[PDB]
Amino acid sequence: AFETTTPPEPPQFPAEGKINYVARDTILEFKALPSYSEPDWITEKFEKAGKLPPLKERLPEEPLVYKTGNMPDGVGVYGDTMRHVVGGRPEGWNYIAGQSQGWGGIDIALSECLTRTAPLFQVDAKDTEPLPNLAKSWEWSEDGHTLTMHLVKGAKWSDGEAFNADDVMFYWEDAVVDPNVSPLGGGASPEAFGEGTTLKKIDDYTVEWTFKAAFPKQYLYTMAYPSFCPGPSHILKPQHPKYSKNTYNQFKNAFPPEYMNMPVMGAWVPVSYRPDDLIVLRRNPYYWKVDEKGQQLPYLNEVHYKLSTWADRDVQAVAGSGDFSNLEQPENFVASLKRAADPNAPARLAFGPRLIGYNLQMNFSANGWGNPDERGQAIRELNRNEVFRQAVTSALDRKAIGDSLVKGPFTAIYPGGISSGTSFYDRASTVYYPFNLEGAKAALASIGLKDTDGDGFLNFPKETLGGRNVEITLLVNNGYATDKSLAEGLVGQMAKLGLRVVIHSLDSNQRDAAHYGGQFDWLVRRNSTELSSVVQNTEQLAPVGPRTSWNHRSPEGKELDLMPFEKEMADIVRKFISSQDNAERADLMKQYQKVYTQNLYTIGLTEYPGALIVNKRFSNVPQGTPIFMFNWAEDAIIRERLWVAADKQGKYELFPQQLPGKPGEGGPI
Numbered sequence: 001a002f003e004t005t006t007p008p009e010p011p012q013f014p015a016e017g018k019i020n021y022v023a024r025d026t027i028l029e030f031k032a033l034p035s036y037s038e039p040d041w042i043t044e045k046f047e048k049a050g051k052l053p054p055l056k057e058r059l060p061e062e063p064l065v066y067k068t069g070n071m072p073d074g075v076g077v078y079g080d081t082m083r084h085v086v087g088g089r090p091e092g093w094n095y096i097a098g099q100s101q102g103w104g105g106i107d108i109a110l111s112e113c114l115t116r117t118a119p120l121f122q123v124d125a126k127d128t129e130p131l132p133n134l135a136k137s138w139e140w141s142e143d144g145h146t147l148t149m150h151l152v153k154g155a156k157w158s159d160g161e162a163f164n165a166d167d168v169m170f171y172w173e174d175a176v177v178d179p180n181v182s183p184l185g186g187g188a189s190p191e192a193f194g195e196g197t198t199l200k201k202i203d204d205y206t207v208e209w210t211f212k213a214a215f216p217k218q219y220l221y222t223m224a225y226p227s228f229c230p231g232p233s234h235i236l237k238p239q240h241p242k243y244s245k246n247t248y249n250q251f252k253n254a255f256p257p258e259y260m261n262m263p264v265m266g267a268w269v270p271v272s273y274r275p276d277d278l279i280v281l282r283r284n285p286y287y288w289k290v291d292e293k294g295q296q297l298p299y300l301n302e303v304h305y306k307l308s309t310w311a312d313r314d315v316q317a318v319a320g321s322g323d324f325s326n327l328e329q330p331e332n333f334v335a336s337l338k339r340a341a342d343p344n345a346p347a348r349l350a351f352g353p354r355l356i357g358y359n360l361q362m363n364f365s366a367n368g369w370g371n372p373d374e375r376g377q378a379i380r381e382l383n384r385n386e387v388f389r390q391a392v393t394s395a396l397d398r399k400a401i402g403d404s405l406v407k408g409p410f411t412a413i414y415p416g417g418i419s420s421g422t423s424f425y426d427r428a429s430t431v432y433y434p435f436n437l438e439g440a441k442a443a444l445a446s447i448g449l450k451d452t453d454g455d456g457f458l459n460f461p462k463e464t465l466g467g468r469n470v471e472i473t474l475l476v477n478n479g480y481a482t483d484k485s486l487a488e489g490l491v492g493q494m495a496k497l498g499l500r501v502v503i504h505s506l507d508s509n510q511r512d513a514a515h516y517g518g519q520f521d522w523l524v525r526r527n528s529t530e531l532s533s534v535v536q537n538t539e540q541l542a543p544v545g546p547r548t549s550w551n552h553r554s555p556e557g558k559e560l561d562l563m564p565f566e567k568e569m570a571d572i573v574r575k576f577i578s579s580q581d582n583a584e585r586a587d588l589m590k591q592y593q594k595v596y597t598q599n600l601y602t603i604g605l606t607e608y609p610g611a612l613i614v615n616k617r618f619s620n621v622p623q624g625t626p627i628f629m630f631n632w633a634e635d636a637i638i639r640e641r642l643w644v645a646a647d648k649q650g651k652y653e654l655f656p657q658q659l660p661g662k663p664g665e666g667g668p669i
């Protein structure tokens, strides 16, 4: 019915990075050093005064050592604060039970994971093994069904309690496996680690994975942020319903934002919270990472998270009051570029490849996900109809969508699927449905949708919902001008096609609950890592498990109502996960792209590049860091390795020469 082609090549984007490509093992290694050091005030006021054990006793026998060769500016010096600005708000500290701490890097810094992938933008390959983090090493069995994983040994939580296999086991059994606990991010279901996957404790520093498939090496990426980042089991386990009288909601909410010094494996500990104002973190004296000179990380003593808006983060970063931003909203591009064009500018700004994409996602569950009413059920049936999807995508004037955000070479025609900025992308495999409003109108008439009351809006046939007007709800994230502008643009374009679309605008926390609970017809969403990188959270590319897909999940308790193209996509993704053949993997992503875009698994709105904004006083910021690839730039830049030269340091510490207090107690000690 439609004359499909490939999407047109966008304008050339001059100077992205450039990235200084390195080999995987140039960044870090685990080893003992001859001696260790720390800020002088810790030795004088805490160690010598009895208050803390000497540094060597606090560290693992073999800490994680950052290699000097990979440091952009070399070994650092202690001091200063990194000031972040966020549009989110904390719910509390229970990350593994699905509570947000405010986004914008806070949970990334607090909740460290088994592996780490964000700094891998500097390795020029897509078969890179994730960096060891809380898991120091691992080995595959000969048959590839068993993965023996060795943990960092001798590391402690920020309160001095030992980190070991008990924390790993508690997260796996009582958060992942437990169907009443869902970690933050919408992922981390048991099937995200493979169907029938088991994890068992061997000893205090050894765990063992058992996989149905042979060598599913892709799951090492799933073990990084956000899906395998354990909480302090000694604090959380006594609050869990399996070991107490608490309900699941009581367990989820047992650590509100007012609860101080929540134990972490991260470089800084939350010490202060003021509603709608600020979160202050102070250096963790038990941090288990050091530089090659034996200096215990982080270099920065303090981190701030100013509670504001996402657009204010850009404003503060270019003004110099904020130290970091991911410039990701096109309506802020011109003003940010103008302010950064001044040679006296306090911050540096650098655009990367086109990795920020937006999709229209349709709820594909016709078997009760989100318990829809008669109206909602009739929309699910239209969403599952391929002619309806072809009409919706063909009624979009993608050039006009791009123009509505920003002029210039930023936007690209985006039909959906894998981002054009990543190496697995193939233009020839991308099905583009050009703007054909007349063809879209004929396609809807062919499935029995026609305006029977002269109001310009299409009615269902008399057999469905008494022949009333089709009414579609659109779930939108209220925190971003981009999301809201795209939603408004979509409503106008659908009105021309004859479909009535109603915006349901919600704040982040409520938006995530409505989405993951399946309480939506359609939604507007910025793409997560699987479309920007393929290799990070690959399970999110298709409904490989009952809850791995963003738009097709099963209600509890029920199975998936997969359409044939979705089963073909699930098969491609599972084959990719267990393949170590580069040529086969590239071919599988071409087939994946083709099936996705031909069948309209989602409908692309637009795609463009973002820019990293960092205050100039910071040393060790890697060149060409993208804002979003394997993770957000807050992770990729390795904040625990950043430093400021003594003569350039700001004097912004709110708790200078202080360390975190005890969990559930007072302010910094």
Ligand SMILES: OC[C@H]1O[C@H](OC[C@H]2O[C@H](O[C@]3(CO)O[C@H](CO)[C@@H](O)[C@@H]3O)[C@H](O)[C@@H](O)[C@@H]2O)[C@H](O)[C@@H](O)[C@H]1O
Binding pocket: 088, 103, 104, 105, 106, 108, 184, 185, 186, 310, 326, 328, 477, 479, 508, 509, 512, 525, 526, 527, 528, 529, 632, 634
């Ligand atoms: O956390 C660092 C990040 O914070 C801000 O974005 C947070 C954003 O996260 C969620 O949105 C996405 C995109 O749809 O969903 C995946 C998984 O949760 C995230 O990777 C991705 O951002 C929430 O659904 C949003 O409500 C929430 O605001 C900020 O925009 C980023 O630049 C970066 O600082």
Ligand SMILES: [Ca+2]
Binding pocket: 007, 008, 009, 010, 011, 411, 412, 413
């Ligand atoms: Ca284009």
Ligand SMILES: [Ca+2]
Binding pocket: 022, 023, 024, 025, 123
């Ligand atoms: Ca390498």
Ligand SMILES: [Ca+2]
Binding pocket: 023
């Ligand atoms: Ca090499």
Ligand SMILES: [Ca+2]
Binding pocket: 039, 040, 041
């Ligand atoms: Ca000192």
Ligand SMILES: [Ca+2]
Binding pocket: none
């Ligand atoms: Ca001893």
Ligand SMILES: [Ca+2]
Binding pocket: 067, 068, 069, 070
């Ligand atoms: Ca080196």
Ligand SMILES: [Ca+2]
Binding pocket: 068, 073, 074, 075
């Ligand atoms: Ca050096």
Ligand SMILES: [Ca+2]
Binding pocket: 039, 040, 078, 079, 301
């Ligand atoms: Ca200091």
Ligand SMILES: [Ca+2]
Binding pocket: 079, 080, 081, 649, 650, 651, 652, 653
């Ligand atoms: Ca400071």
Ligand SMILES: [Ca+2]
Binding pocket: 084, 085, 086, 103, 104, 105, 313, 324, 325, 326, 634
């Ligand atoms: Ca931020």
Ligand SMILES: [Ca+2]
Binding pocket: 141, 142, 143, 144
């Ligand atoms: Ca074997």
Ligand SMILES: [Ca+2]
Binding pocket: 059, 060, 061, 062, 153, 154, 155
């Ligand atoms: Ca040890």
Ligand SMILES: [Ca+2]
Binding pocket: none
């Ligand atoms: Ca000990």
Ligand SMILES: [Ca+2]
Binding pocket: 166, 167, 168, 170, 171, 230, 231, 232, 233
């Ligand atoms: Ca845990």
Ligand SMILES: [Ca+2]
Binding pocket: 175, 176, 177, 178, 179, 180, 181, 182, 183, 188, 189, 190
């Ligand atoms: Ca679970």
